[PDB]
Design a protein around this ligand. Sequence first.
Ligand SMILES: C[C@@H]1NC(=O)N[C@@H]1CCCCCC(=O)O
Ligand SMILES: C[C@@H]1NC(=O)N[C@@H]1CCCCCC(=O)O
Ligand SMILES: C[C@@H]1NC(=O)N[C@@H]1CCCCCC(=O)O
Ligand SMILES: [Mg+2]
Ligand SMILES: [Mg+2]
Ligand SMILES: [Mg+2]
Ligand SMILES: [Mg+2]
Lengths: 225, 226, 230, 228
Amino acid sequence: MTILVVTGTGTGVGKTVVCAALASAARQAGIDVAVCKPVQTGTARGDDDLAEVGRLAGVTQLAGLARYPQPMAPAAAAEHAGMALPARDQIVRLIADLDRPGRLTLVEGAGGLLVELAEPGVTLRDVAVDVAAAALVVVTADLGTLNHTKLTLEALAAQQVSCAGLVIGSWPDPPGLVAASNRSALARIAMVRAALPAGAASLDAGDFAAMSAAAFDRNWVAGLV
Amino acid sequence: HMTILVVTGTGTGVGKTVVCAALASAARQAGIDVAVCKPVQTGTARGDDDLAEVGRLAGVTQLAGLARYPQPMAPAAAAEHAGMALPARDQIVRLIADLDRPGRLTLVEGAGGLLVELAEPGVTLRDVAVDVAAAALVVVTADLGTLNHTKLTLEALAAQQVSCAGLVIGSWPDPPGLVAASNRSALARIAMVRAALPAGAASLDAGDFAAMSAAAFDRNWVAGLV
Amino acid sequence: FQSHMTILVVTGTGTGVGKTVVCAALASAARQAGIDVAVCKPVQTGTARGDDDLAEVGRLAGVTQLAGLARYPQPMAPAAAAEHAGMALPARDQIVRLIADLDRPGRLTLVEGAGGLLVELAEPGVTLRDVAVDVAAAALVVVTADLGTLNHTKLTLEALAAQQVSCAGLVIGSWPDPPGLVAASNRSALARIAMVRAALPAGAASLDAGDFAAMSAAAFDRNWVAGLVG
Amino acid sequence: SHMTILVVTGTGTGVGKTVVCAALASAARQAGIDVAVCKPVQTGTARGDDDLAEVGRLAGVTQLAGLARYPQPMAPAAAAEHAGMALPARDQIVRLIADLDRPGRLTLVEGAGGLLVELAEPGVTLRDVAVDVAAAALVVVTADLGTLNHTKLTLEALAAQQVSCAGLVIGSWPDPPGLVAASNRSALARIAMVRAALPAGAASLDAGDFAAMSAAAFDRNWVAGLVG
Ligand SMILES: C[C@@H]1NC(=O)N[C@@H]1CCCCCC(=O)O
Ligand SMILES: C[C@@H]1NC(=O)N[C@@H]1CCCCCC(=O)O
Ligand SMILES: C[C@@H]1NC(=O)N[C@@H]1CCCCCC(=O)O
Ligand SMILES: [Mg+2]
Ligand SMILES: [Mg+2]
Ligand SMILES: [Mg+2]
Ligand SMILES: [Mg+2]
């Protein structure tokens, strides 16, 4: 089994693009890639993180269980619809079924690590434990990332989930004073696996793929499977 | 014990997706929990997304899928163009068996008609229904040619002892015409017609869709499904 | 030395798929190999709209040995076209006899269905597939290259096999120029489930007798056509 | 120590830690409690920031104790680096706090940013200081999207070092709360006690109105019992 949960320090942090960028680099090295997003909120607004990964990295095994119209935490969205979340069992078997020899499976949750994905109080962290996934955590390069990062790293270490490293979801065009010290700081805390250019999400499939193959150590990511 | 309905059709573009939405809505209004699974979806560059359709029309949130292909082709063809295999038989059967729970109606939509390959190796919605002991609902047109495609699909169900839950006419013309009205009578002679959905139902808003759907099915038959 | 005719029931995945133009083209390819050809249309509907598949074949292939039986004015399924006209459907026996009367050694006889395989041609629920069992015909099935073709053809093949009516192969009734991606992958997929005997160019039904004749000779494998009757 | 000491942390910078110190200081004062407020590490002076100064202005407290002050509104380590300065020593922060020691006193200690922000070398945080001085922790949160994750993360970092949690406070509550805000409050009250939710705009009130808002914001029995 070769599963990696892609969590992050919160929502709107670059987890989806990182999913796409890793997917579209694992491919370039001839790795088969599936992406799972069990619970997707904000559909009335057009949120579809699976589609975005399909467009950007071309992945095709794109799996999901539940979608809620309202753009809030899954449990909030669920209850503003009057309809439960999936069960831990649905989410765990779904992911585990996705796994193939030679295949990288990426799981994006919703928001940060301890967001409730299933009933009762089940998180991406419980999922990772049950599928023996390592975790890749996506972080901003902005004010607050160090605290949010350390706080996520500890919460992972507390259930003995491996961090496979960090990825800056957006790295500034003019690279900034805060951002630069933040990167030096993060780098001393953990292995920073990639830093994605700031506009990577709005590139075209060829752009993105040259971007992605440049973003990651071909050696670390081939060694994932 | 399981309450899954496979929702199949005589082909692609006959109303399977709108029928799942209408059945789901009618079931929801009867107080039944509904899950909809579409394991494989093609045409994601056309912008095709049936689960999204079902969500908007019927408000179902338990919407499960496994794969999505950009090219508007049969799943196996889409897969081959992309260089990326289809899901696996047991992947589909377990997804579906996991969705299922007591009092819940789980609906499964395939890609195109009954015999389209959805999984490897050479697996169809019919094979899946066998594995899961699901009856199949058959969506038909009202147009010239429906009797043959319909009879042909009903024989394929019977060949593997998958039950027919009945037919639904996915789009009913206004005004009908001589063919449609004749086909409607002729369809009713070979199978129970659970509903005939009015043409253009797919463009209705959720509130309009709900009222149409409550009226399209017999609540007793829907309630009985569970 | 075949002492009786070879009968092919030419069915389709539906109506409008090119059955008639395929009969016409095979009749033509076979006449050019020295085989005498009869074409039979036991149930013709839509005659009040000018539908006449037998006349179409004579126009295109010059075939003159043309056998019909039932003609209903309304363009609908046989059973409904008959009811509308206050007529009845013919009997199974009348159909089989229409066919058996055409018998000569080494003749190729083509029987064009109305619509696809399981259309009711005689009461009660008698189809072209039961006719084929009665006259020991192999089936030639006409398919499109369009979306939906693989399901419809697999459906048609499986129903044939259920009564042990053997398959003589597939014919694409209209083949586009050039083919897009769906068409090209449909043809490859179709060639994995069965022998694809030919793929008539889009607009074949529209050629001159002389053009149509050239087309039909190029369309089929001559060794297949030649072995049809011996 | 003879004092009771509460560290006031948050899910980040800009959540209302300062105005919650102000508000609790004003509520504690009105209950007859001697209050001191302490800010060991202050950044952002270039922008105009003085959290100690702001507390005096809002609440009227005069026992304010500060130590390190940096110009740039960056994390303390980066702020100090940019200024060519050091971070304070650990025993310094602890001294600053101990020296406020008086029987009967409520001492509030505001962190810089969130809980795991480095205040002293090497990676000494408000959490480590809380243990040093036997302080419970008050957690200031937003009612915005992302709050549930950030507070659970914080709550569990406290428990991991057996730092007692004195409760949550929402730093800014919108009168007419949207759907998310209302949902977020109900969910926060499930995982811990919400001691107060300060009206949005609390920090631009005059002293008299700020005192009356503060006495209303908190349960006076809880406040009075912090020095118990
Ligand atoms: C010859 C008639 N004219 C026409 O265009 N099609 C009719 C014959 C097709 C019958 C198809 C019946 C069905 O399967 O529904
Ligand atoms: C679901 C997919 N969307 C679409 O446009 N057609 C596909 C349906 C499958 C049809 C397969 C074509 C055939 O059977 O030949
Ligand atoms: C996916 C939904 N769309 C969106 O804009 N954010 C939601 C996800 C984030 C949930 C954060 C819950 C919390 O931590 O409070
Ligand atoms: Mg995302
Ligand atoms: Mg559909
Ligand atoms: Mg014809
Ligand atoms: Mg402050």
